[PDB]
RNA sequence: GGGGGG
RNA sequence: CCCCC
């Protein structure tokens, strides 16, 4: 293996792959534990590295090499006397899981060998390697599933504590199954998350939630809107967008599942923002978040602003992506509008109309399209011909820095006297980077929604909302780091405070 | 007393009197400042008000000196001239003054308590006017002004010229200088508080304006119009007005050339040979003429009213193309002082790097395939400007994959970091660090790559980089807004290295790259002379504004879609830290994820485009950490403009196919891009080419770049080095003799004096009167650098002066009890400027014992060992041969002081300072070898090349030094130049023997060697005139360069030798292609012992293509053979003239009997070709017959 | 003769 | 009734490869 | 900070 | 060390 099972099995406890109690197999893995004590010993000799990584890969992996100046070759001859004693039929194989969380815990010295080897890569499914693999099937208990109809006695399905481990999908408490049917001689794998399948529009849909099934009140047949606020924080859809998710989707099957490890890169860009929050060397920390319209980002960042407020204790501002859009509709005629912070927060309320929605309503009436069905009926060429006209009404506001121009809007708001020190600003597309400012942090935010279905769901704006979504989506390639909402809440727990 | 009345001033020749007289005067200027103030403000000078004379073309002008009242009466400092934002997180958004406002220096103070917002700002402005202003190439700024004004005295032999009153009117206040710079504090220091704050920069303005007068661009009358234009710009902000007006006052020439109508110009051919003159009309196309109207109303406003009439004078009077280039060169030195521009870093940071969207937005590609994060993988455009570029670049994707597979990228990345270190990577974060002496190397690239070794292959290494802000460095340049560059961390830079390697592969596939390669000769611009000569052409040089701020986030994806398709077909397993593995992947039109194999680089290309944050943080002394808004192009991740070059040429050639579907045949010839500068050539009818010209202007506007479209029938610009009708025009102002960015001023002399030769030879064809530069740069070397600042120890300090005073005088400071060191300042004789590995500066005629003067050297004389011949020439070689004596004539050399000039050269001062540091400062042993032995582990094993290198040495021949094995390089990577530290006491500890060689000097002699007999050839003028080659007939009118005007000696030199060789310059370009000195050190192998050349390949580890270039580069090269007697002619020092010495054999005759039987026939041409270039001043149509020393031939056969 | 004058005279005669 | 295809992103990809007139 | 050439 | 983006 890469990571050594024997020194610390707790990592493979997370995947639910347990060592067999203790044959060629058992004698083999004890050899691998000796090699990792050896490779760690050579590590410290030269700044934590190896010396001839292609020379070690020939000895350990292929087994075709025998070694007999003393200064440079002393480490190799010590390796050769060890491996030659094993009398193996062939060389040992290197193994690596597909999961990035497994890769982030691999020792530095193993990575040096990997480039001169051909590692056997075990594919995962949802953060879980398939158990049919040749190596995992020999070294670890093969997990056995127990469902509704599948529940039975051990005698009906021949099983031993040696060979097999039990997974519980029945949904009854594990203490009952362990105590009632005599399964206390087997070890149960445990899963702290959930994998919930939903009925979608286009087809069946799956999902992953970072919360335990007891803490999530959803059961079979539940409505999507019930407990919707919990899913938006901790859920991840795992199907290609667009999905089938709707306001009226229902649950089919719910099972315990492994927790999703937060992305290593997404935590890095967010902690870069938190480093600017704590230190006094920076005057303004400002996070920028883009999302496709209709993702509900304003619903999530209203709470994420409060969670950050409890930590640092500073008053955190918040500006919805339509804050400038409504404020431009009010003060376009007034010559010297107020830029005071709380006055702009007063105009962020949903009841007011954005300026951009007004100009887009005329552009649809100019072709006479007020119906969702008439808009869906159009060819892609007919829509793209219109979105170029919407690009003209947008460049008019970004072209220059004027008193009513958008760049001066975020300048006077950010540099106002009473404005909060830390801000959280939303934006609709990448081209707004020059306007909203001035930051080293920017992230995309992917909720669990079909935003093009969510726009058809809402009945107020109708076509004007769905049309602006595609006009923003056309100008918003995913060129910045992606961030699911749970990783932002995970970002705050890991960072130390004070 | 003084310099305008010297015997050297009237005869311009050295003698036993005037040369010893001109030494006493210049040494008196550099040594004592009290004599300098009396020189610059002398009472005998007469003030000038109205003045009259001739302009650049001989027309009579009448101008009047006018100093604006606002410099004599500076306004009190105004706090509101630098407003802040209400939060005071930064300067206020809109603000007028990015540079200095002019104000009285005594009006600026800060009463505020320390550690306050307003206290730190006034401390910054005090840091502004007292620090940023001083930028001097040599010594004090007052000595630099003396060398220029001293040159004007000797050249015109008169104290009375207009430029002097500008010095006496501005800078004469009190008994002493208004301000002096102290090297110890690196600050200007004001002795008179009433002076205007901007004045110290104007000393650099007069030093530039005084250079143009010696240069012959500006005459005494046009100098008055120039100086008023700068003093007019001193109100209210000296640099803001220059950056605003500079675009308008240089661009007028288009309309003035329109009025010349007919003109006759040489016609170049494809091969860079002139085939004839041609009478072409210079009338502009109608659409160019309509643009003149908008300029006139604009030139009547922003321009100075008197300087505006000067340009109206130019559009009227000039009647030939040479007159227009003379008025144009005159305007060039009136619109620019040539100084480096400087501000507070955060003041200029606003408008330079802040992103700006202009005209249409860029739209996204459709996403054909995506990562489980929904990152892009491969993508394609349905429509837009991005589809236009993809219709072109998509045909190159497959062929590049076959070349990407061949490179072993881990060997490339380790070699890529070696080319440039230190890289200013962020310093060590925390304890220990182990270390522990690696902090001495903490600022480096290869050292930081070596320290982080086990970290290299970890994927986590990349995400650690994302938490590090990108520090912003500022690299200033002449006559331009201050630039904001972004330095990057190793791993942060590494993410873009894979896209870069694909980016430079395209250059082999096209001729569209102006950055392809450059030779530095006239062949660099050689294609431009061809297209400017052609009929029915519409030239277009489209400069593009911004490009840092003009590339929005969505614009960069046009380049990514090209790399992503190339990385898709490429098969490069384990690029590191990455694998060629499977992946779960989402496709367009399929519901659930599919399973697609992925190679290593296609991950690294995807991950880099997926995460993009161009924001450049900067830590400032006022506002803390400031961060520029996102949307910049970083300039540059990995490399650029290789991003822009693939981006622009795809937007342009793809527009040609966009017109193919539209049915319009696309007239066009060739197109070069550096970038970001573009250049086009349209051949066709006047109506059709304009229609295609407007399309290229519009398509770039559609992709978000705004440009100033330039169009002309008879002129073009590239690399700010323009051509008109096959006539090169130089830029004089861009070379700044008197300023530099680093403020690196140090007394080491071969570093500085040999650097000055690189400048004066770069001005050879950018100037109208080269002979004036020789008198200018002599006095600069005769005054600015005559002292040496070596620190002595108190023990040995008394022993040195007891002997050296016999020849070279020096400064004697009283011994200081307080500290250990007692300083000395070493004055040197003027003779050191002319000796080998001294200044090697061109010399004036000397006086022999016979009384005949030696030949007057020109700008074309070679340097290197050839300069030693001047020693023998003083002894009269023509007399040396008739007596058959090799005697050196040491007595006469003691007069001029050559005997003392070589004593300073025998110290090897610059070699001991290097050796003394190498001992202690580099621990080597386990400290350095442990990283080199580790650093080898990442490279594709292995380079044992030292075993293949010393194989060439024994026996074998010596080779030096570093062409391979950069694991001795990180020792050099710690220069420890700042400071010299305490090791200087050990640097002179070895000099205790070097003042033991001065007591051992006794009577001193100049050493000679048996190889030194080669100098003894001297030519005797014959009678028959040389029939002249045809090129002179075509260039005889409307000359192709400022110093090649008809009858000028620079023109006549091209007439005798002719133009540069075709196949020789294309081939010599290739030995510089591998380099990105190796040629000559390896060429002795090709001549003496040829069998070492094969191991010469494996010692350098050159590839099979690199092996055949050096073999092929010795083919057309060996026709002029090897140098047993070497010379150094810079390719910039020449430009048009032939480089091959064989060209000069035609105009000299040799007796047959001097040849060796089958050897060295080709060596006499170097004796001839080097001699004709040395003296083109006295050359007048005479064939030459050389004579040889009888002992020279005995040496050649031995 | 000045050098330039000699140079010019030489140039003219060859090219008449 | 609705299809994965009517979504704008889906429609756009298609437009990416049977580009119609 | 990187690229082009002496 | 110069030229150039
Ligand atoms: N029934 C109905 N509710 C609507 C409609 N439009 C908006 N809503 C309300 O909007 C709420 C959802 O908020 P969000 O998903 O954050 O929408 P948003 O605030 O505009 O945020 P963005 O979509 O990112 O701009 C729902 O709870 C609804 O009450 C509509 O047309 N019909
Ligand atoms: N006080 C003062 N210092 C000057 C002046 N000019 C230059 N300096 C610098 O200040 C330092 C001390 O000043 P001085 O003793 O007057 O130096 P100096 O008269 O210019 O003599 P030199 O340094 O040999 O040129 C010197 O190292 C100079 O570099 C000046 O006019 N007055
Ligand atoms: N040392 C530097 C500085 C920056 N860049 C390039 O310089 C370009 C910016 O050119 P700049 O002179 O700042 O803008 P312009 O004046 O408009 O350039 P030009 O006149 O040549 O069009 C950028 O594309 C960047 O890639 C570079 O490669 N080398």
Coordinates of C-alpha atoms in Angstrom, one line a residue, chain B residues 17 126 344 347 387 627 629 706 770 852 921 987 1004:
Chain B
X17 CA 51.5 70.3 -22.9
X126 CA 9.1 63.6 2.5
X344 CA 5.2 56.7 -4.5
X347 CA 0.0 56.6 -6.1
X387 CA -15.1 31.3 -32.2
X627 CA -4.9 44.7 -2.9
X629 CA -9.0 44.4 -8.0
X706 CA -9.4 49.5 -27.3
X770 CA 28.6 61.0 -33.7
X852 CA 53.1 63.5 -36.6
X921 CA 30.6 33.6 2.6
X987 CA 40.1 41.8 1.0
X1004 CA 58.4 50.0 -13.7

